[PDB]
Design a protein around this ligand. Structure first.
Ligand SMILES: Nc1cccc(SC[C@H]2CCC(=O)NC2=O)c1
Ligand SMILES: [Zn+2]
Length: 105
């Protein structure tokens, strides 16, 4: 249990080694304006994604960061968001834990 893959197609996305404790925790439970709850895991790094649109600061769960939607680059599954424009770190990924599958490298 050290690699994260897209639950829908198996695309390589991230690693347990790349977990990032933003505000002292890698897990953040958050709600969007449509009331959907997400268990978000923060990663320093991810791969195999496709970032859609231009960054937005509106409704950001992380103060000082703008977000872009992150799809699975293979199947188009919505896996979370890329954050940028902030400080320490400048960028990171917030990925939806239940849309990933954890397993061996
Ligand atoms: N109106 C509307 C309907 C669905 C979603 C949204 S923004 C969705 C996410 C983006 C990432 C973030 O940090 N906060 C959010 O809330 C806005
Ligand atoms: Zn996928």
């Amino acid at each position: 249990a050290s690699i994260f893959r897209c639950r829908q197609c198996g695309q390589t996305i991230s690693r347990r080694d790349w977990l990032l404790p933003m505000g002292g925790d890698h897990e953040h439970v958050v709600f969007n304006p449509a009331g959907m709850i997400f268990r978000v895991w923060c990663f320093s790094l991810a791969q195999g994604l496709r970032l859609i649109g231009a960054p937005s600061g509106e409704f950001s769960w992380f103060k000082g960061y703008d977000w872009t939607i992150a799809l699975c680059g293979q199947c188009g599954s919505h896996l979370g968001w890329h954050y940028e424009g902030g400080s320490q770190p400048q960028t990171f990924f917030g990925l939806i834990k239940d849309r990933l599958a954890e397993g061996p490298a």
